[PDB]
Amino acid sequence: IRRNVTDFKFGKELGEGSYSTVILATDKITGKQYAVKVLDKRHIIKEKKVKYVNIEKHALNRLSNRLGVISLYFTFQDKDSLYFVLDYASNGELLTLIKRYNTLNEECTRHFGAQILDAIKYMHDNGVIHRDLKPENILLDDKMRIQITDFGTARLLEKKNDESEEYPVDVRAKSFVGTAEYVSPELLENKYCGKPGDVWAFGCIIYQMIAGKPPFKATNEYLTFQKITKLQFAFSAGFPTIIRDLIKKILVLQPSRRATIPEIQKHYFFQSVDFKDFDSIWLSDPPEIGP
């Protein structure tokens, strides 16, 4: 026969939202676990998040089934709700992995860092700029490999056969949900972002992977925005200089002076990594997790 919705076994809730709800689903025949994202239509109409939904859907249609990102297998809907059957990341968020031992070692940071950089590289290649990058939306699959979700704030480009879609991201607004610590300075200021924005966020992420806390972590958001706009971040006493230089050339106010992806690839910290041997990036045995 064929495959349909009735072949599924819905289980635990993987986390609700302000307009969405992720529920664990399991194929009764194959055993393959998925993550069904249930969105209430009236909730996205009342707040006009249809553009977010379409940007996410479009990004998922762009980014096909690769290892670095969550993939949308199929979709279905009734009259009140819309359903997104996605990938299931067994090992939760990257933030939880970081908060496991507070910090991470240099080897693991290089590993998962190469993974993340590869993912971002792929996204930028397929004309997708996530803009909103943070350890909250970086998950880990069953075999301990990173993935990227929440493509609602993404940006599209090439206009090859599908056109470009860039909508402003007012961080200081009320519609913005998040901590806004991993937000690029230009994105905070002029409500728009480019490729080096995800690079900035990447720098914040690896900095957090070593130190244990975001580079621009503050009490409120005034001091946060102040730290972002004044570049007020200081490395810890015992901090790897090799990574320190990388952060210093990544976390830069001017996006033009900011280090690009291939430059990060050709860094002294990533000389131990070949980004063409992507069997070593993904299928490698994850190093002993620890601080």
mmCIF file of C-alpha atoms in Angstrom:
data_model
loop_
_atom_site.group_PDB
_atom_site.id
_atom_site.type_symbol
_atom_site.label_atom_id
_atom_site.label_comp_id
_atom_site.label_asym_id
_atom_site.label_seq_id
_atom_site.Cartn_x
_atom_site.Cartn_y
_atom_site.Cartn_z
ATOM 1 C CA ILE A 1 0.000 0.000 0.000
ATOM 2 C CA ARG A 2 1.055 3.603 0.646
ATOM 3 C CA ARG A 3 2.053 5.815 3.592
ATOM 4 C CA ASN A 4 -0.436 8.108 5.353
ATOM 5 C CA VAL A 5 -1.191 9.961 8.606
ATOM 6 C CA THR A 6 -2.904 6.935 10.180
ATOM 7 C CA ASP A 7 0.446 5.116 10.189
ATOM 8 C CA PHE A 8 1.696 7.433 12.940
ATOM 9 C CA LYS A 9 1.863 7.236 16.738
ATOM 10 C CA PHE A 10 1.795 10.628 18.450
ATOM 11 C CA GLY A 11 3.393 10.699 21.896
ATOM 12 C CA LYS A 12 4.867 13.279 24.263
ATOM 13 C CA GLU A 13 4.792 17.030 23.678
ATOM 14 C CA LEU A 14 8.276 18.298 22.819
ATOM 15 C CA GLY A 15 7.452 21.884 23.764
ATOM 16 C CA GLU A 16 4.586 24.301 23.177
ATOM 17 C CA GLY A 17 4.708 27.810 21.727
ATOM 18 C CA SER A 18 2.799 31.080 21.423
ATOM 19 C CA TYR A 19 1.303 29.838 18.154
ATOM 20 C CA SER A 20 2.837 26.398 17.612
ATOM 21 C CA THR A 21 3.171 23.036 19.371
ATOM 22 C CA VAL A 22 5.695 20.275 18.694
ATOM 23 C CA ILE A 23 4.467 16.722 19.284
ATOM 24 C CA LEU A 24 6.593 13.574 18.969
ATOM 25 C CA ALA A 25 5.297 11.230 16.271
ATOM 26 C CA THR A 26 6.469 7.712 15.421
ATOM 27 C CA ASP A 27 5.937 5.672 12.254
ATOM 28 C CA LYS A 28 4.326 2.387 13.319
ATOM 29 C CA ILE A 29 5.855 0.577 10.344
ATOM 30 C CA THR A 30 9.433 1.862 10.128
ATOM 31 C CA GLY A 31 9.858 3.121 13.686
ATOM 32 C CA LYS A 32 11.313 6.376 12.370
ATOM 33 C CA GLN A 33 10.645 9.187 14.854
ATOM 34 C CA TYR A 34 9.494 12.608 13.648
ATOM 35 C CA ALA A 35 8.536 15.951 15.178
ATOM 36 C CA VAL A 36 5.096 17.207 14.160
ATOM 37 C CA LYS A 37 4.733 20.971 14.563
ATOM 38 C CA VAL A 38 1.067 21.876 15.041
ATOM 39 C CA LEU A 39 0.197 25.501 14.266
ATOM 40 C CA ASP A 40 -3.186 27.051 15.061
ATOM 41 C CA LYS A 41 -4.259 29.123 12.055
ATOM 42 C CA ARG A 42 -6.339 31.685 13.965
ATOM 43 C CA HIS A 43 -3.371 32.383 16.242
ATOM 44 C CA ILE A 44 -1.120 33.152 13.265
ATOM 45 C CA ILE A 45 -3.848 35.210 11.588
ATOM 46 C CA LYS A 46 -4.578 37.357 14.651
ATOM 47 C CA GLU A 47 -0.902 38.321 14.907
ATOM 48 C CA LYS A 48 -0.129 38.089 11.177
ATOM 49 C CA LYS A 49 2.701 35.554 11.365
ATOM 50 C CA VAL A 50 1.734 34.112 7.985
ATOM 51 C CA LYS A 51 4.912 35.678 6.617
ATOM 52 C CA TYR A 52 6.937 33.840 9.272
ATOM 53 C CA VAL A 53 5.199 30.583 8.360
ATOM 54 C CA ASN A 54 5.836 31.121 4.643
ATOM 55 C CA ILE A 55 9.472 32.128 5.190
ATOM 56 C CA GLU A 56 9.979 28.984 7.272
ATOM 57 C CA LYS A 57 8.221 26.801 4.680
ATOM 58 C CA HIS A 58 10.194 28.410 1.846
ATOM 59 C CA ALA A 59 13.492 27.944 3.688
ATOM 60 C CA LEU A 60 12.574 24.311 4.323
ATOM 61 C CA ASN A 61 11.803 23.905 0.622
ATOM 62 C CA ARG A 62 15.174 25.473 -0.203
ATOM 63 C CA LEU A 63 17.190 23.527 2.359
ATOM 64 C CA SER A 64 16.420 19.958 1.302
ATOM 65 C CA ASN A 65 17.298 16.804 3.224
ATOM 66 C CA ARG A 66 20.848 17.460 4.420
ATOM 67 C CA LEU A 67 22.470 16.551 7.750
ATOM 68 C CA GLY A 68 23.044 20.081 9.038
ATOM 69 C CA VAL A 69 19.423 21.224 9.291
ATOM 70 C CA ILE A 70 15.898 20.106 10.171
ATOM 71 C CA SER A 71 14.078 18.838 7.076
ATOM 72 C CA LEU A 72 10.375 18.981 6.206
ATOM 73 C CA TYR A 73 9.298 15.562 4.929
ATOM 74 C CA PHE A 74 5.618 16.228 4.252
ATOM 75 C CA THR A 75 2.722 18.406 5.390
ATOM 76 C CA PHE A 76 -0.988 18.055 6.148
ATOM 77 C CA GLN A 77 -3.806 20.161 7.597
ATOM 78 C CA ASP A 78 -7.455 20.178 8.637
ATOM 79 C CA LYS A 79 -9.563 23.316 9.082
ATOM 80 C CA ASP A 80 -8.195 24.823 12.297
ATOM 81 C CA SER A 81 -4.575 23.653 12.264
ATOM 82 C CA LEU A 82 -1.572 23.147 9.976
ATOM 83 C CA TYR A 83 0.923 20.335 10.554
ATOM 84 C CA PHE A 84 4.673 20.267 9.868
ATOM 85 C CA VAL A 85 6.251 16.806 9.927
ATOM 86 C CA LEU A 86 9.926 17.502 10.621
ATOM 87 C CA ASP A 87 13.061 15.796 11.939
ATOM 88 C CA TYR A 88 13.316 14.563 15.521
ATOM 89 C CA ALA A 89 16.441 15.546 17.449
ATOM 90 C CA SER A 90 16.763 13.032 20.281
ATOM 91 C CA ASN A 91 19.474 14.788 22.294
ATOM 92 C CA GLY A 92 17.744 18.133 22.841
ATOM 93 C CA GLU A 93 19.325 21.562 22.398
ATOM 94 C CA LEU A 94 22.989 22.562 22.199
ATOM 95 C CA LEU A 95 22.372 24.923 25.117
ATOM 96 C CA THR A 96 21.586 21.913 27.304
ATOM 97 C CA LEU A 97 24.798 20.230 26.149
ATOM 98 C CA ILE A 98 26.718 23.366 27.105
ATOM 99 C CA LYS A 99 24.907 23.598 30.442
ATOM 100 C CA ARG A 100 25.665 19.920 31.084
ATOM 101 C CA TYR A 101 29.226 20.659 32.194
ATOM 102 C CA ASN A 102 28.762 24.454 32.193
ATOM 103 C CA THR A 103 31.554 24.692 29.606
ATOM 104 C CA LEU A 104 32.970 22.481 26.852
ATOM 105 C CA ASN A 105 36.491 21.351 25.974
ATOM 106 C CA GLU A 106 38.429 22.644 22.965
ATOM 107 C CA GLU A 107 38.156 19.437 20.925
ATOM 108 C CA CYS A 108 34.363 19.195 21.158
ATOM 109 C CA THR A 109 34.116 22.927 20.472
ATOM 110 C CA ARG A 110 36.171 22.402 17.307
ATOM 111 C CA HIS A 111 34.017 19.411 16.320
ATOM 112 C CA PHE A 112 30.525 20.836 16.800
ATOM 113 C CA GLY A 113 31.930 24.192 15.701
ATOM 114 C CA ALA A 114 33.005 22.748 12.361
ATOM 115 C CA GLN A 115 29.560 21.154 12.129
ATOM 116 C CA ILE A 116 27.745 24.443 12.780
ATOM 117 C CA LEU A 117 30.006 26.340 10.377
ATOM 118 C CA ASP A 118 29.273 23.700 7.738
ATOM 119 C CA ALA A 119 25.531 24.069 8.320
ATOM 120 C CA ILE A 120 25.658 27.871 8.064
ATOM 121 C CA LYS A 121 27.809 27.533 4.939
ATOM 122 C CA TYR A 122 25.179 25.278 3.363
ATOM 123 C CA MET A 123 22.370 27.672 4.316
ATOM 124 C CA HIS A 124 24.220 30.635 2.814
ATOM 125 C CA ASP A 125 24.940 28.570 -0.301
ATOM 126 C CA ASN A 126 21.248 27.783 -0.781
ATOM 127 C CA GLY A 127 20.414 31.449 -0.239
ATOM 128 C CA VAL A 128 19.136 31.244 3.331
ATOM 129 C CA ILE A 129 20.237 33.659 6.059
ATOM 130 C CA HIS A 130 18.863 32.500 9.423
ATOM 131 C CA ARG A 131 19.555 35.852 11.128
ATOM 132 C CA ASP A 132 18.176 34.517 14.424
ATOM 133 C CA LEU A 133 20.908 32.103 15.520
ATOM 134 C CA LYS A 134 21.225 30.877 19.113
ATOM 135 C CA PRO A 135 21.911 27.683 21.134
ATOM 136 C CA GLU A 136 18.139 27.482 21.708
ATOM 137 C CA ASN A 137 17.478 26.569 18.063
ATOM 138 C CA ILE A 138 20.547 24.378 17.591
ATOM 139 C CA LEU A 139 19.528 20.804 18.375
ATOM 140 C CA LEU A 140 21.355 17.472 18.570
ATOM 141 C CA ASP A 141 20.163 14.259 16.903
ATOM 142 C CA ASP A 142 20.352 10.712 18.277
ATOM 143 C CA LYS A 143 23.937 10.135 17.118
ATOM 144 C CA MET A 144 24.958 13.481 18.643
ATOM 145 C CA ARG A 145 25.071 15.823 15.639
ATOM 146 C CA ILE A 146 23.954 19.458 15.439
ATOM 147 C CA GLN A 147 20.914 20.701 13.515
ATOM 148 C CA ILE A 148 19.273 24.092 12.969
ATOM 149 C CA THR A 149 15.575 24.898 13.418
ATOM 150 C CA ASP A 150 13.290 27.951 13.663
ATOM 151 C CA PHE A 151 13.612 29.236 10.090
ATOM 152 C CA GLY A 152 10.925 31.858 10.712
ATOM 153 C CA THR A 153 13.335 34.791 10.870
ATOM 154 C CA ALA A 154 15.291 33.539 7.851
ATOM 155 C CA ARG A 155 16.163 35.583 4.757
ATOM 156 C CA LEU A 156 15.981 34.448 1.124
ATOM 157 C CA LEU A 157 18.159 35.622 -1.769
ATOM 158 C CA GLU A 158 19.010 34.294 -5.237
ATOM 159 C CA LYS A 159 15.662 34.926 -7.004
ATOM 160 C CA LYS A 160 16.655 32.142 -9.418
ATOM 161 C CA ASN A 161 13.177 30.640 -9.713
ATOM 162 C CA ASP A 162 11.906 31.538 -6.250
ATOM 163 C CA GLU A 163 12.121 35.217 -5.301
ATOM 164 C CA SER A 164 13.752 36.953 -2.330
ATOM 165 C CA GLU A 165 11.991 37.710 0.959
ATOM 166 C CA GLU A 166 13.577 40.061 3.498
ATOM 167 C CA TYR A 167 11.404 41.435 6.297
ATOM 168 C CA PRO A 168 12.685 43.719 9.097
ATOM 169 C CA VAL A 169 13.571 42.323 12.524
ATOM 170 C CA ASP A 170 12.800 44.949 15.158
ATOM 171 C CA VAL A 171 14.619 43.510 18.166
ATOM 172 C CA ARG A 172 13.359 46.239 20.503
ATOM 173 C CA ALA A 173 9.766 45.560 19.420
ATOM 174 C CA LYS A 174 7.172 43.475 21.258
ATOM 175 C CA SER A 175 6.758 40.936 18.466
ATOM 176 C CA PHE A 176 10.371 39.881 19.023
ATOM 177 C CA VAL A 177 10.608 36.778 21.205
ATOM 178 C CA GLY A 178 13.984 35.848 22.679
ATOM 179 C CA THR A 179 16.964 37.079 24.685
ATOM 180 C CA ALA A 180 18.561 39.128 21.885
ATOM 181 C CA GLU A 181 22.100 38.381 23.086
ATOM 182 C CA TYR A 182 23.207 36.649 19.895
ATOM 183 C CA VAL A 183 21.884 39.490 17.748
ATOM 184 C CA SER A 184 24.223 41.244 15.305
ATOM 185 C CA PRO A 185 24.819 44.965 15.923
ATOM 186 C CA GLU A 186 23.613 45.909 12.428
ATOM 187 C CA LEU A 187 20.512 43.741 12.877
ATOM 188 C CA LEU A 188 19.802 45.481 16.181
ATOM 189 C CA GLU A 189 20.308 48.932 14.670
ATOM 190 C CA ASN A 190 18.942 49.058 11.121
ATOM 191 C CA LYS A 191 16.597 46.062 11.535
ATOM 192 C CA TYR A 192 18.340 44.217 8.690
ATOM 193 C CA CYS A 193 21.052 41.565 8.508
ATOM 194 C CA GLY A 194 23.393 39.835 6.069
ATOM 195 C CA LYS A 195 25.586 36.729 5.915
ATOM 196 C CA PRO A 196 28.115 37.902 8.542
ATOM 197 C CA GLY A 197 25.228 38.169 11.012
ATOM 198 C CA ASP A 198 25.053 34.403 11.390
ATOM 199 C CA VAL A 199 28.847 34.539 11.639
ATOM 200 C CA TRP A 200 28.561 37.022 14.510
ATOM 201 C CA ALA A 201 26.043 34.740 16.197
ATOM 202 C CA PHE A 202 28.408 31.825 15.548
ATOM 203 C CA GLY A 203 31.172 33.679 17.367
ATOM 204 C CA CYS A 204 28.826 34.321 20.272
ATOM 205 C CA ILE A 205 27.934 30.617 20.266
ATOM 206 C CA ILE A 206 31.500 29.261 20.348
ATOM 207 C CA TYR A 207 32.441 31.924 22.899
ATOM 208 C CA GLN A 208 29.595 30.532 24.991
ATOM 209 C CA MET A 209 30.852 27.018 24.261
ATOM 210 C CA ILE A 210 34.186 27.872 25.875
ATOM 211 C CA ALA A 211 33.257 30.386 28.592
ATOM 212 C CA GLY A 212 29.829 28.978 29.442
ATOM 213 C CA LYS A 213 28.013 32.297 29.085
ATOM 214 C CA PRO A 214 27.177 34.586 26.111
ATOM 215 C CA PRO A 215 29.763 37.307 25.305
ATOM 216 C CA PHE A 216 27.202 40.085 25.729
ATOM 217 C CA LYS A 217 25.304 38.667 28.698
ATOM 218 C CA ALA A 218 23.745 41.352 30.891
ATOM 219 C CA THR A 219 21.112 41.843 33.590
ATOM 220 C CA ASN A 220 18.544 43.645 31.431
ATOM 221 C CA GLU A 221 18.410 44.593 27.746
ATOM 222 C CA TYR A 222 19.688 48.158 28.054
ATOM 223 C CA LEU A 223 23.075 46.949 29.274
ATOM 224 C CA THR A 224 22.816 44.138 26.715
ATOM 225 C CA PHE A 225 22.340 46.514 23.783
ATOM 226 C CA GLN A 226 25.050 48.666 25.355
ATOM 227 C CA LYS A 227 27.468 45.723 25.392
ATOM 228 C CA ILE A 228 26.594 44.870 21.789
ATOM 229 C CA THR A 229 26.934 48.432 20.466
ATOM 230 C CA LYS A 230 30.071 49.214 22.495
ATOM 231 C CA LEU A 231 31.619 45.759 22.000
ATOM 232 C CA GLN A 232 31.871 45.251 25.762
ATOM 233 C CA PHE A 233 33.044 41.657 26.154
ATOM 234 C CA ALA A 234 36.103 40.322 27.967
ATOM 235 C CA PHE A 235 37.623 36.850 27.710
ATOM 236 C CA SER A 236 38.115 34.844 30.906
ATOM 237 C CA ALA A 237 41.492 34.553 32.645
ATOM 238 C CA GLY A 238 42.116 31.024 31.393
ATOM 239 C CA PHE A 239 41.001 31.290 27.774
ATOM 240 C CA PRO A 240 42.530 29.561 24.710
ATOM 241 C CA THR A 241 44.405 32.234 22.737
ATOM 242 C CA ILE A 242 43.859 30.353 19.468
ATOM 243 C CA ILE A 243 40.096 30.644 19.921
ATOM 244 C CA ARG A 244 40.461 34.132 21.412
ATOM 245 C CA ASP A 245 41.911 35.463 18.154
ATOM 246 C CA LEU A 246 39.092 33.835 16.173
ATOM 247 C CA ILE A 247 36.484 35.459 18.417
ATOM 248 C CA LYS A 248 38.291 38.797 18.142
ATOM 249 C CA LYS A 249 38.104 38.651 14.342
ATOM 250 C CA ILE A 250 34.523 37.337 14.351
ATOM 251 C CA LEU A 251 32.904 39.612 16.943
ATOM 252 C CA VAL A 252 33.428 42.848 15.011
ATOM 253 C CA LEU A 253 31.116 45.880 14.864
ATOM 254 C CA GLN A 254 31.592 46.474 11.140
ATOM 255 C CA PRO A 255 30.200 43.563 9.080
ATOM 256 C CA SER A 256 32.555 44.527 6.246
ATOM 257 C CA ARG A 257 35.613 44.041 8.458
ATOM 258 C CA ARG A 258 34.023 40.889 9.876
ATOM 259 C CA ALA A 259 35.621 37.498 9.183
ATOM 260 C CA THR A 260 33.818 35.522 6.469
ATOM 261 C CA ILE A 261 33.164 31.765 6.401
ATOM 262 C CA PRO A 262 36.186 30.621 4.331
ATOM 263 C CA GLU A 263 38.425 32.829 6.486
ATOM 264 C CA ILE A 264 37.143 31.008 9.572
ATOM 265 C CA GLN A 265 37.795 27.768 7.688
ATOM 266 C CA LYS A 266 41.402 28.844 7.098
ATOM 267 C CA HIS A 267 41.984 29.820 10.735
ATOM 268 C CA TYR A 268 44.642 28.372 13.053
ATOM 269 C CA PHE A 269 41.836 26.854 15.123
ATOM 270 C CA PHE A 270 40.294 25.135 12.102
ATOM 271 C CA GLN A 271 43.510 24.015 10.406
ATOM 272 C CA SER A 272 42.907 20.662 12.079
ATOM 273 C CA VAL A 273 39.639 20.381 10.152
ATOM 274 C CA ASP A 274 39.093 19.590 6.473
ATOM 275 C CA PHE A 275 35.695 20.929 5.409
ATOM 276 C CA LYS A 276 35.653 18.710 2.320
ATOM 277 C CA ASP A 277 35.950 15.516 4.349
ATOM 278 C CA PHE A 278 32.391 15.948 5.629
ATOM 279 C CA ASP A 279 32.365 12.331 6.777
ATOM 280 C CA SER A 280 34.809 13.490 9.442
ATOM 281 C CA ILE A 281 32.572 16.440 10.299
ATOM 282 C CA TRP A 282 29.390 14.425 10.801
ATOM 283 C CA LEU A 283 30.106 10.688 11.094
ATOM 284 C CA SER A 284 33.001 11.170 13.521
ATOM 285 C CA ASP A 285 32.783 9.672 16.999
ATOM 286 C CA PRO A 286 31.920 12.598 19.310
ATOM 287 C CA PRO A 287 34.823 13.288 21.724
ATOM 288 C CA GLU A 288 34.445 12.682 25.466
ATOM 289 C CA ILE A 289 32.072 15.452 26.554
ATOM 290 C CA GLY A 290 33.483 17.468 29.449
ATOM 291 C CA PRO A 291 34.789 20.865 30.629
#
